[PDB]
Amino acid sequence: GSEQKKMKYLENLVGKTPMLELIFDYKGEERRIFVKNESYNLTGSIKDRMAFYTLKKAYEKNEIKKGAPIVEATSGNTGIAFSAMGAILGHPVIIYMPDWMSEERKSLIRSFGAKIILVSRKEGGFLGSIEKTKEFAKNNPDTYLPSQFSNLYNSEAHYYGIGLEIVNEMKSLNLNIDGFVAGVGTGGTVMGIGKRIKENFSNAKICPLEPLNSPTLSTGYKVAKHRIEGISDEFIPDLVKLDKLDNVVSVDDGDAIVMAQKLAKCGLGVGISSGANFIGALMLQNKLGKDSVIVTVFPDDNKKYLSTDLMREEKVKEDFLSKDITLKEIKNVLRV
Amino acid sequence: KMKYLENLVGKTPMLELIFDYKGEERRIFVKNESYNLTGSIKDRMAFYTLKKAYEKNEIKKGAPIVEATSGNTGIAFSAMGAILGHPVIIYMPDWMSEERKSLIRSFGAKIILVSRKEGGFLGSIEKTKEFAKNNPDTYLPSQFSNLYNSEAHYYGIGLEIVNEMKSLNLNIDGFVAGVGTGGTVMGIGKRIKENFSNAKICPLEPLNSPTLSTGYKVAKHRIEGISDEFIPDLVKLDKLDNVVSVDDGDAIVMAQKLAKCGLGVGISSGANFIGALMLQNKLGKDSVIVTVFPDDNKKYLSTDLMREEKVKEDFLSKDITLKEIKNVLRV
Numbered sequence A: 001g002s003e004q005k006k007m008k009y010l011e012n013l014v015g016k017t018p019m020l021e022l023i024f025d026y027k028g029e030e031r032r033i034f035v036k037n038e039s040y041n042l043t044g045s046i047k048d049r050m051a052f053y054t055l056k057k058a059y060e061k062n063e064i065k066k067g068a069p070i071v072e073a074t075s076g077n078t079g080i081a082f083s084a085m086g087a088i089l090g091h092p093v094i095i096y097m098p099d100w101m102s103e104e105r106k107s108l109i110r111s112f113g114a115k116i117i118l119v120s121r122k123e124g125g126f127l128g129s130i131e132k133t134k135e136f137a138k139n140n141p142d143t144y145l146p147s148q149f150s151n152l153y154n155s156e157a158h159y160y161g162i163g164l165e166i167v168n169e170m171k172s173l174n175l176n177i178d179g180f181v182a183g184v185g186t187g188g189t190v191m192g193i194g195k196r197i198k199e200n201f202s203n204a205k206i207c208p209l210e211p212l213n214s215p216t217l218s219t220g221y222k223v224a225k226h227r228i229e230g231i232s233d234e235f236i237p238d239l240v241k242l243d244k245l246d247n248v249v250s251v252d253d254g255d256a257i258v259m260a261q262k263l264a265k266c267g268l269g270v271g272i273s274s275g276a277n278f279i280g281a282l283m284l285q286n287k288l289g290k291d292s293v294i295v296t297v298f299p300d301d302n303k304k305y306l307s308t309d310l311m312r313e314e315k316v317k318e319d320f321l322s323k324d325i326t327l328k329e330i331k332n333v334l335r336v
Numbered sequence B: 001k002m003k004y005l006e007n008l009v010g011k012t013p014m015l016e017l018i019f020d021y022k023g024e025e026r027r028i029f030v031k032n033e034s035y036n037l038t039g040s041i042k043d044r045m046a047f048y049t050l051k052k053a054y055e056k057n058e059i060k061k062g063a064p065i066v067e068a069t070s071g072n073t074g075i076a077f078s079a080m081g082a083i084l085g086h087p088v089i090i091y092m093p094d095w096m097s098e099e100r101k102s103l104i105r106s107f108g109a110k111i112i113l114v115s116r117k118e119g120g121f122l123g124s125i126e127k128t129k130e131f132a133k134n135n136p137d138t139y140l141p142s143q144f145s146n147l148y149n150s151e152a153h154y155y156g157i158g159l160e161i162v163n164e165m166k167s168l169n170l171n172i173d174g175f176v177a178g179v180g181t182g183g184t185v186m187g188i189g190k191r192i193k194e195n196f197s198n199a200k201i202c203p204l205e206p207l208n209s210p211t212l213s214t215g216y217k218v219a220k221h222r223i224e225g226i227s228d229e230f231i232p233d234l235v236k237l238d239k240l241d242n243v244v245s246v247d248d249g250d251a252i253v254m255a256q257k258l259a260k261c262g263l264g265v266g267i268s269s270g271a272n273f274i275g276a277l278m279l280q281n282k283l284g285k286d287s288v289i290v291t292v293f294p295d296d297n298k299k300y301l302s303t304d305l306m307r308e309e310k311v312k313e314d315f316l317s318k319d320i321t322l323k324e325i326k327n328v329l330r331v
């Protein structure tokens, strides 16, 4: 080949992230959770694995030509990841997002060479941001649409990549996996990792996670704004197939923030969705038994969240799990 | 012990970058050090310093770790300090990017900003000694003089460099790195010279504040992480080859180009790229030059990196065009 050569080496920019064994007290019995740290990636997120897999398989299946624009609707880690990997592969990148999105998001995505097209309230969300991507393709037929919320390459990325890493590294510790939890944005993470884990541990519980403040998985709908950036921003996406998963876990965004704060104070600088996943995983442990082996992921680091409530004191509410959690140690770290 | 905590640092990607320089094709090789616990090369050094300190009982259980930083070292010691159960107290000049202050505080460290009136970098260092004098159990990693700093890079990143270039059957002709503490250049340089006695090991300075090359001149500059108002004891300019000098404007424009090609890096990464080119010009078109990208662009959104830089006539970046990533290695 040659393109094949290129894709073989560019994959060294993504994956092979640390697996961490985190020990903590939960009122006040000793527990542990296993977690992948996905900050160790090209642009700092799990979405790098997904963007790379997507573009690679698309090249393999001749579904994108050289120099073709990559076009998507997002303001988060997906725009960042396709912007960077798009530029690496010689593609201009076009991102549609709403016109009230913060300066910080726009500047970071702009840094990576993408063209940003802003959509107003009146031009329709949000939902109309994904509509203009479809318009663009019909007027420029070389357009590749990642279609993150519906594209099987997304879930597959995590089946072939991070999911397999998880099964391999838990097997090297001779630990069976009793469960896995992940917040759903596109759903690619929970679906892909779940498919992989359930091939190896048929009784594993694969629980998708939503915010209690906007339970898009349990109701179907975008109910309200919440502060768990990267998860449930729109509608149960087409990729998520709830029937193939076990029961929905719900976490309050404040509880996620406090948990992420605690994580940073033990030297793990993570995003709000990571704190959510940690709480998520503990909930699942609480259903299965204190000593069950539960895995999750930390999808990004804390550096993009330095003006969010991650930086402020959160009111502790009755039902927060995080008020009864004290982190003790990183007991082990695996890197394969 | 932490045979296992070392899995949080190091083993980062080596990139082969192809570019045009007015208007000839060239390449340089670069370690991407964002792929580390806190997103910087300093993670390697913080971990190694603490591991040795523990080995030689230079640090007591729960004792405070206290340090002066341009940002990344404090971030790194706040994260690793927290992991190992230590209070951390960081002094940092007040003109470093505000994202630095926020991250240090997120890791549970006490952060004290130090003004130019209060002596900037030299003042920050003295405040660390003051704290140690006042509080007898204090551990001072003293990154500006501690040989563990350069040792960390001799054993870690330096050895990865040598093995990665060996794997390409390529001889290293030169290495360039901006000097903050001097750890990076001294430690990598020692390792490279053991394997290529003729390789040139070049420290880099801002052209705006050429302290290494003059021995005295200190001025404001925006190349965060390097040129900290003095020549650090760790750096031995007579054991290194000649100083390379890059304009902070030229560095920023170069870091901006790198991000447009997919490599979101800090201002000093831009500086190092231009430096490695300036060295390449000395040794030949075809010479094999290695450098490092110490961190990513996320701590710099508040800085001139995100603004439109006045290009000048003498910027090498006005004549650079990035072509592609030709290769990526990682063991």
Ligand SMILES: *Cc1c(COP(=O)(O)O)cnc(C)c1O
Pocket (backbone or CB within 6 Å): A045, A047, A076, A077, A078, A183, A184, A185, A186, A187, A188, A189, A190, A229, A230, A231, A271, A273, A274, A299, A300
């Ligand atoms: C995208 C994203 C998620 C959700 O992952 P999906 O695979 O899209 O479900 C969680 N956290 C962060 C920070 C993200 O960017």
Ligand SMILES: *Cc1c(COP(=O)(O)O)cnc(C)c1O
Pocket (backbone or CB within 6 Å): B040, B042, B070, B071, B072, B073, B178, B179, B180, B181, B182, B183, B184, B185, B224, B225, B226, B266, B268, B269, B294, B295
């Ligand atoms: C510390 C630092 C440097 C300089 O490295 P030394 O090993 O201290 O010479 C360069 N760039 C950045 C971003 C840094 O934090």
Ligand SMILES: [Cl-]
Pocket (backbone or CB within 6 Å): B068, B069, B070, B071, B072, B073, B074, B180, B225
């Ligand atoms: Cl520093």
